[PDB]
Paper text:
Consistent with this sequence conservation, PDZ3c binds to Myo7a MF2 with ∼1 μM affinity, the same affinity as the Myo7b MF2/PDZ3c interaction. The structure of Myo7a MF2 bound to harmonin PDZ3c was determined at 2.6 Å resolution. The harmonin PDZ3c binds in the same overall manner by inserting the Cter motif into Myo7a MF2’s central FERM cavity. Such slight adaptability of the FERM groove results mainly from conformational variability in the F1 lobe. The affinities of PDZ3c for either Myo7a or Myo7b MF2 are similar despite these changes, showing that some adaptation of the binding mode in this FERM cavity can occur without much cost in affinity. However, several deafness mutations suggest the importance of this domain for the integrity of stereocilia. However, mutations affecting three surface residues (K2118N, G2163S, G1982E/R) suggest a role for the surface next to the F1H2-S5 loop and the F3 lobe in making specific interactions with partners. Interestingly, these four mutations significantly weaken the interaction with PDZ3c, suggesting the importance of the Myo7a MF2/harmonin PDZ3c interactions in hearing and a functional role for harmonin-a.
Myo7 is a crucial component of the tripartite complex that maintains the necessary mechanical tension across the cadherin links. The Myo7 tail domain consists of two MyTH4-FERM (MF; myosin tail homology 4; band 4.1, ezrin, radixin, moesin) domains separated by an SH3 domain. Harmonin plays a pivotal role due to its ability to interact with cadherin as well as all other components of the complex. The results presented here reveal nearly identical interactions between members of the Myo7/harmonin-a/SANS:ANKS4B tripartite complexes that link cadherins to the actin-rich core in stereocilia and microvilli.
Author numbering:
A (entry chain B): 433 to 552
B (entry chain A): 1707 to 1733, 1742 to 1977, 1986 to 2173, 2178 to 2206
Write the structure that this text describes.
Amino acid sequence: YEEGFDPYSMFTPEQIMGKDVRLLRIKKEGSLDLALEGGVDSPIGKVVVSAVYERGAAERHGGIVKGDEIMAINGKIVTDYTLAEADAALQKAWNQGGDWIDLVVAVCPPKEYDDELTFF
Amino acid sequence: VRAKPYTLEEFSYDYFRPPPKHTLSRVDRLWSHTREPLKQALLKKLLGSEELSQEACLAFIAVLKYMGDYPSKRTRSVNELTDQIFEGPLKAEPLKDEAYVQILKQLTDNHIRYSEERGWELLWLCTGLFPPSNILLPHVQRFLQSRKHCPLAIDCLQRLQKALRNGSRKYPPHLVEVEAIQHKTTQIFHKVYFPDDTDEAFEVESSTKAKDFCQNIATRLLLKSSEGFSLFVKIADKVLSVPENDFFFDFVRHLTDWIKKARSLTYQVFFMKKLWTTTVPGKDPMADSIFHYYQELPKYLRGYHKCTREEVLQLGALIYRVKFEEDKSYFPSIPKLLRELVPQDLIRQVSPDDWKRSIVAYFNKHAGKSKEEAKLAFLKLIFKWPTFGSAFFEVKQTTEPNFPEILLIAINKYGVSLIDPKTKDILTTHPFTKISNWSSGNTYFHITIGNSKLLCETSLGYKMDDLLTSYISQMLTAMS
């Protein structure tokens, strides 16, 4: 299963240096409800989760959160994809073929700072 | 003979679609009330426009439903039918005149009293969203002027004037607008919250723009200037500033609509200092009294500033004085109220009773000063610091290698400052004049310096972006 995934079969030690790389095999029921942001072009220079909507599929699985990095979609590495290239690949993996979607993600570490309140 | 009330009969002859060719052969006027849905838009202009005629017929079934002239249900939202009526004209100009002629038609020779009372609510809602064209406007005015005895006719005429002046709305009527007119009340009052833990009810109209609203609050509060002040909407988690030229009801409606897509839809309207450029303590007594002290106090207590022990004892004794004035009966309560008197990070540096003894000594040095004088004395001491009037953000920076990963970012009149969170030392200040570009996402905030790039990991990029945009705009317009 997903607990039996080796990220070194897909990535070089330099590629996943310090990253916590996991495999998520999402169910494939209705809407994926997972938004992306970034792209190779962008300031962050990677594909990250911008929102996991409460409705389901990505939320129902629970393995993926806002800030996590999308590294591969159905075996195809998406690290140097643009935002439009990534969104197209994510939708095409969800709509076209299979009974599941295979997402390789770099799990974002806990926020070591107050990222909620602002005093004006 | 007394003149009958004005109808769209004469207007219809030139601007309504002609009657079907079979009409004359047949030995229920287009400009008069029906219970029969339209199959084609009223206006001759929409004849060719298939997509627009379609939307005009959908909005008319919503006008029928609202007025009880078409079956519906015990509808969930008070604004479910009114959104269907106005979403069309708000997204397309040709549909704006269709909205008026449809409503006016349904108010012309309407036998049903329940129906006619509901159509009036719709015309009142319409007059606060957008005016009719220059061609139609006189007819709408003559329609209203000949029906002065109807309780909403003079208000619709008044709203028309405000709609011609302020321009058109972008979002359908808010639930407070719909509930007000259904409750037979044309005046709306909205609560506004201030940093001094008080609130007040201010009158709001459909045409109210955040700038006018801000000016009425400023006038009320006897402020010397409304410059740097702004409305803020606190909904769910989010706290957004309201753009100066935005319609108050459009901002709230859109923000609540947006929150509803990702989901209690309860909001709070705040008035606060946003930009601190022109702020000088002593200049404006009410601005200092209500806003400046109360806004700078929690920033200070979070430990965002670099201060000496002499200053924390002085400010501690000054806070006590704002809270209890000359009363010394809350002196033994200083250990219990330390989180309210001393910055978070320094509390552990000294025992609760050593703080109590030091604060009690400094208070007696502040003579017989009032709660108000104490607010100014606190402000004047902190105005000496380069971090006064800042917006502080805790971020994870990914671009600077000599700087810590966790940074404290202060956005104030001097630009963007990167502060060491531990020492409270300013590592660098990037003036607004040296900031060439910026962007934000849900997980970041980026700034380009010159022809140097800074990437911050944050969920507050939207706020930072707004502040950077507002400060740079303020300066750029001041340079004219």
